[PDB]
Structure 1
């Protein structure tokens, strides 16, 4: 009886949202945010081998689709690799944590990647930072994603997509 109650009421993934306020207490940390920003930035292009190396840490297997850029050289992109995990009916429009300084464009027409635009599960512009995957950040895209696809999709996402951030961070160089 004690084991059944512990499994049915006290599991970690069932308590992603804290009772103090409506917002996730389990979320991205410090290396995760930097990796997400570096992978999501506009200037990231990956080859087939790099994409395979990045996706080897997750459970994803299937069709990658056509590369984002076909000629002169076949290049993928960070947003295309990220978009393989978002549900196919998820929409989100909101600013990023880097939209505070001179990058504030306050609308979708932004020369920077300072505005997040997701339509039908496709990440079209914007970067991931503390305001999208960070912990203790209510009304973020992670919060809405969990709220609409259960702690089940919350746990699946946190287990899968959060490892590509670390893998890409160590694939690139991050020093001080």
Structure 2
């Protein structure tokens, strides 16, 4: 998105700084991770596009569940340094354990993050209003109470 580039024949140039001061300037000022937030409107410019959002929805949608091998393989593929799987979310028939998408996604978030908002999939405002009321009445709701009112 920052380059406004798509892989349909676009060509892009590359330059190599030749002096140590120029290399230091490029390394300190011009690193990509420095410019995540756009200066035009104070919002992110680098972010997930297309398949990233679609896969996120597929992973975190209601009813999504994964098996032992899928969870291990996807965590190893993502590069997460996990060494012990969490408790299974539900048990399938034949005794197989299953993990929900929420649990898998939560392993990537910082340990102390807290936030709530409304996304583009909101279609029944009563469901969101109930959750907002529950969060407003006490700033720390019981997770087992939120999971009864969970809505996409």
Distance 2:64 2:109 in 1: 19
Aligned partner of 1:106 among 128, 132, 135: 128
Count of equivalent residues: 114
Aligned partner of 1:12 among 10, 32, 38: 32
Q: Which runs of 5+ in 1 are unaligned?
A: 111-118, 128-176
Aligned partner of 2:104 among 81, 84, 87: 81
Aligned partner of 1:24 among 34, 38, 44: 44
TM-score (norm 1): 0.58
- The CA deviation at 1:64 is 1.7
Aligned partner of 1:64 among 77, 85, 100: 85
- The CA deviation at 1:53 is 2.0
Aligned to 1:42: 62
Cα deviations by residue, 1:20-60 (Å, 9 ceiling, x for unpaired): 11110000101111110010011001110111122221221
Cα RMSD, aligned residues only: 2.4
- Partner of 1:92, secondary structure, is coil
Q: Kindly indicate which of the two structures has a greater share of residues assigned to strand.
A: 1
TM-score (norm 2): 0.66
Q: Which runs of 5+ in 2 are unaligned?
A: 1-20, 133-140, 142-146
Distance 1:62 1:19 in 2: 40
